[PDB]
Amino acid sequence: QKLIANQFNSAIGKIQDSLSSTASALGKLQDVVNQNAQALNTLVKQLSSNFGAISSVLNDILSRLDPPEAEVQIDRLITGRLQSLQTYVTQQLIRAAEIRASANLAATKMSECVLGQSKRVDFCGKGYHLMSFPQSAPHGVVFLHVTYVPAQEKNFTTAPAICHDGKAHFPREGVFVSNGTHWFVTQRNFYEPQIITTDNTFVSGNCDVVIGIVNNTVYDPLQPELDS
Amino acid sequence: ILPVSMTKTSVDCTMYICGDSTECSNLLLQYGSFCTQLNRALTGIAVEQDKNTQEVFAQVKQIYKTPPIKDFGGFNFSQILPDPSKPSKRSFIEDLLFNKVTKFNGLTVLPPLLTDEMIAQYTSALLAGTITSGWTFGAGAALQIPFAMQMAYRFNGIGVTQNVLYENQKLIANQFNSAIGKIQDSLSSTASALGKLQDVVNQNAQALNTLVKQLSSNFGAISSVLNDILSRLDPPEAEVQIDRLITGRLQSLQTYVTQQLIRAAEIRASANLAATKMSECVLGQSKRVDFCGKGYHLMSFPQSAPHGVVFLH
Amino acid sequence: NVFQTRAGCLIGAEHVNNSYECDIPIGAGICASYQTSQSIIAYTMSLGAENSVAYSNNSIAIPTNFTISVTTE
Numbered sequence: 184q185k186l187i188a189n190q191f192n193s194a195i196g197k198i199q200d201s202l203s204s205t206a207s208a209l210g211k212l213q214d215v216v217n218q219n220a221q222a223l224n225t226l227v228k229q230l231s232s233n234f235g236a237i238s239s240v241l242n243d244i245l246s247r248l249d250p251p252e253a254e255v256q257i258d259r260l261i262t263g264r265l266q267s268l269q270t271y272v273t274q275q276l277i278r279a280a281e282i283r284a285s286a287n288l289a290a291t292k293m294s295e296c297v298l299g300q301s302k303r304v305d306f307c308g309k310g311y312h313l314m315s316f317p318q319s320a321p322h323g324v325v326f327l328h329v330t331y332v333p334a335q336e337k338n339f340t341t342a343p344a345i346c347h348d349g350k351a352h353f354p355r356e357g358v359f360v361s362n363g364t365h366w367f368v369t370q371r372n373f374y375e376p377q378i379i380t381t382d383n384t385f386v387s388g389n390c391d392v393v394i395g396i397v398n399n400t401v402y403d404p405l406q407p408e409l410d411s
Numbered sequence: 412i413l414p415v416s417m418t419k420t421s422v423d424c425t426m427y428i429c430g431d432s433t434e435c436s437n438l439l440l441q442y443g444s445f446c447t448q449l450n451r452a453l454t455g456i457a458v459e460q461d462k463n464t465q466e467v468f469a470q471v472k473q474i475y476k477t478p479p480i481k482d483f484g485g486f487n488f489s490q491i492l493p494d495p496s497k498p499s500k501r502s503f504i505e506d507l508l509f510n511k512v513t514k515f516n517g518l519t520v521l522p523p524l525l526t527d528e529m530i531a532q533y534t535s536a537l538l539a540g541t542i543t544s545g546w547t548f549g550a551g552a553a554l555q556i557p558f559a560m561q562m563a564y565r566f567n568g569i570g571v572t573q574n575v576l577y578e579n580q581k582l583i584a585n586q587f588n589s590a591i592g593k594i595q596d597s598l599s600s601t602a603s604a605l606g607k608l609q610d611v612v613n614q615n616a617q618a619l620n621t622l623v624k625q626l627s628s629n630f631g632a633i634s635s636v637l638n639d640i641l642s643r644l645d646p647p648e649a650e651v652q653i654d655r656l657i658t659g660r661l662q663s664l665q666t667y668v669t670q671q672l673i674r675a676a677e678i679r680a681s682a683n684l685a686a687t688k689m690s691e692c693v694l695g696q697s698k699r700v701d702f703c704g705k706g707y708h709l710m711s712f713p714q715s716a717p718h719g720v721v722f723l724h
Numbered sequence: 725n726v727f728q729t730r731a732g733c734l735i736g737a738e739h740v741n742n743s744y745e746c747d748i749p750i751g752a753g754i755c756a757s758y759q760t761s762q763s764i765i766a767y768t769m770s771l772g773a774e775n776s777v778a779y780s781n782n783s784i785a786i787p788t789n790f791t792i793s794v795t796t797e
């Protein structure tokens with residue numbers, strides 16, 4: 184717990200440094216917020232375009248021209264501007280589903296990841312996922328995924344089962360391993376080698392069929408308890 | 412078989428409209444940003460078309476490769492582990508796929524950022540890290556585990572005690588091996604297997620032709636060759652006739668782009684679904700019923716296919 | 725100075741036979757980068773690093789220790 188406390192406490196710290204000096208993290212949010220003001224400018228500038236009409240100031244036609252020609256010109260403005268809206272409206276509808284699709288991805292992570300513990304691999308972030316902490320950000324959300332990444336490997340000789348008397352003992356949960364002499368049944372995602380006793384291992388079949396099985400003695404819990 | 416990326420394509424918002432002609436170039440300047448909002452759009456696709464391919468295929472830190480000598484316990488992956496012979500190294504299956512699925516008006520086709528021999532290094536890595544290391548290369552450094560002791564940890568995931576495996580190992584290999592061959596005959600004789608991928612590649616090429624033919628249409632303008640209206644008429648007349656061309660040849664682009672945006676956001680969805688299978692199904696083992704295919708799910712093997720990915724569940 | 729790509733005609737940057745992570749991706753796996761005195765190089769990207777796992781039918785590798793990495797999404 185101690186070592187885990189520090190590894191987490193530190194881990195939060197480094198975030199603030201990734202966030203302090205760097206603008207690359209928030210690109211997603213930032214890229215969205217631009218694409219709007221992007222379009223709006225585009226949408227605004229489209230006012231000052233001629234669109235083929237004599238001028239883009241709607242009343243500087245009307246001074247120049249007697250209405251029946253303006254009525255012809257103001258079309259090319261309307262027809263121009265109107266179309267320019269739909270092109271903007273569409274681009275919102277399309278983009279609004281590019282968010283709407285991301286909402287559901289958050290609305291999921293907010294449920295499964297935060298409120299639960301998500302078995303889905305590399306959904307809740309690379310590694311095994313412990314929990315997650317949401318944080319709001321403008322027009323967006325930021326999850327801090329606390330993930331569990333294993334570290335220090337050690338090679339080991341393994342065997343898929345063990346012959347005791349000709350019965351085959353298989354590990355209930357975890358692998359058989361050995362460091363080269365003694366046989367240890369350990370859990371898979373962390374190394375805690377334990378003597379092999381019949382409560383680690385369930386009997387199944389017998390020894391001729393298995394491919395790879397090795398000899399050993401699987402210790403009896405009970406047999407010592409006997410002799411007195 | 413999932414579409415992943417579509418064909419990255421830009422377009423010249425000017426030449427497409429006004430071929431080789433300044434007379435028409437002016438009257439485009441009137442409409443302003445309708446030229447450059449397009450290239451702003453069509454690029455914002457071709458930008459992410461390599462984000463799609465990125466998220467899907469590169470979930471793996473390092474490019475692994477198989478050990479030299481294959482003994483996996485009787486499973487035969489020689490079908491799917493990359494062919495050393497073909498210079499592009501694409502495991503025997505993927506070369507099937509690449510047989511199935513198959514520069515003018517400003518229309519370009521941009522090169523996909525990742526060439527196949529790259530994509531086929533990843534889907535070699537993934538496929539070759541899944542074998543030895545199991546899922547542990549998605550959670551960290553790849554941890555070699557005997558493939559025959561792997562499957563026993565993919566039976567504990569479907570609720571079958573592992574002693575089923577080791578005793579039935581042989582039979583399972585033959586059931587696995589034999590099951591691979593069919594996939595090669597399945598794919599071999601039928602072009603309606605890949606139709607999805609085949610349809611994407613069609614829909615684009617379907618849309619491009621549609622876009623190109625528009626250059627031959629009158630739109631009420633007396634000709635579809637811009638040079639004509641220029642030559643026979645005096646400018647103040649061509650000022651109008653070229654509008655309808657421009658208007659048409661513009662309103663034909665917005666139609667075209669708005670398609671691509673939609674269609675891309677369809678691919679953008681299918682990519683995320685693939686990158687979800689690649690993450691959940693390939694790397695780990697999936698508990699999500701019928702997400703990884705009919706039946707309980709043991710593992711999955713990705714295989715690239717042109718503008719797509721193909722899983723063997 | 726002139727190079728020739730699979731993507732197109734590249735001008736102003738120097739070829740490099742080495743291969744590093746992708747940096748300013750261009751096309752057909754040619755990723756330009758400014759690392760080098762300096763100049764702009766262009767070099768075929770090597771996807772990822774390279775590794776080959778040591779696999780043998782009795783060889784298993786169990787992590788003895790872990791980290792905790794708070795990511796950000």
Ligand SMILES: *[C@@H]1O[C@H](CO)[C@@H](O[C@@H]2O[C@H](CO)[C@@H](O)[C@H](O)[C@H]2NC(C)=O)[C@H](O)[C@H]1NC(C)=O
Pocket residue numbers: 362363364365
């Ligand atoms: C493998 O690990 C086991 C247990 O950690 C080791 O067994 C003990 O090793 C110590 C090392 O000096 C001995 O003092 C003990 O007597 C051993 N236990 C028994 C019950 O004999 C084993 O030595 C390790 N093997 C290697 C090669 O390191």
Ligand SMILES: *[C@@H]1O[C@H](CO)[C@@H](O[C@@H]2O[C@H](CO)[C@@H](O)[C@H](O)[C@H]2NC(C)=O)[C@H](O)[C@H]1NC(C)=O
Pocket residue numbers: 346396397398
């Ligand atoms: C595990 O140990 C058993 C003995 O407990 C070995 O079985 C012997 O194998 C030899 C090989 O020819 C036979 O001649 C003996 O008759 C076997 N013993 C019995 C009691 O039948 C077995 O070979 C060992 N397995 C491994 C992998 O070393």
Ligand SMILES: *[C@@H]1O[C@H](CO)[C@@H](O[C@@H]2O[C@H](CO)[C@@H](O)[C@H](O)[C@H]2NC(C)=O)[C@H](O)[C@H]1NC(C)=O
Pocket residue numbers: 485486487488489490
């Ligand atoms: C794995 O499968 C491949 C192809 O199915 C096998 O390659 C064949 O091997 C036989 C040997 O009896 C040859 O007659 C064939 O000509 C080979 N085919 C090709 C395309 O090379 C390979 O032997 C199998 N290996 C294992 C271990 O199952």
Ligand SMILES: *[C@@H]1O[C@H](CO)[C@@H](O[C@@H]2O[C@H](CO)[C@@H](O)[C@H](O)[C@H]2NC(C)=O)[C@H](O)[C@H]1NC(C)=O
Pocket residue numbers: 186189190334789790791
């Ligand atoms: C597990 O790995 C961690 C590294 O994340 C080790 O942490 C260091 O352990 C040393 C022990 O010599 C301490 O002096 C350091 O203060 C620890 N560093 C941090 C950042 O906490 C840890 O010791 C390892 N545990 C085992 C059992 O190997």
Ligand SMILES: *[C@@H]1O[C@H](CO)[C@@H](O)[C@H](O)[C@H]1NC(C)=O
Pocket residue numbers: 336337338778
């Ligand atoms: C296990 O053996 C392989 C093969 O020599 C080696 O590459 C690997 O580094 C070894 N494991 C460790 C933890 O060093």
Ligand SMILES: *[C@@H]1O[C@H](CO)[C@@H](O)[C@H](O)[C@H]1NC(C)=O
Pocket residue numbers: 394395396482780781782
């Ligand atoms: C493991 O492989 C080695 C060589 O690859 C071989 O000698 C041995 O018989 C194999 N044993 C098992 C159980 O796979």
Ligand SMILES: *[C@@H]1O[C@H](CO)[C@@H](O)[C@H](O)[C@H]1NC(C)=O
Pocket residue numbers: 738739740741
């Ligand atoms: C790469 O090596 C070749 C020789 O095989 C050489 O001609 C070429 O100049 C080298 N590239 C660079 C950038 O020097």
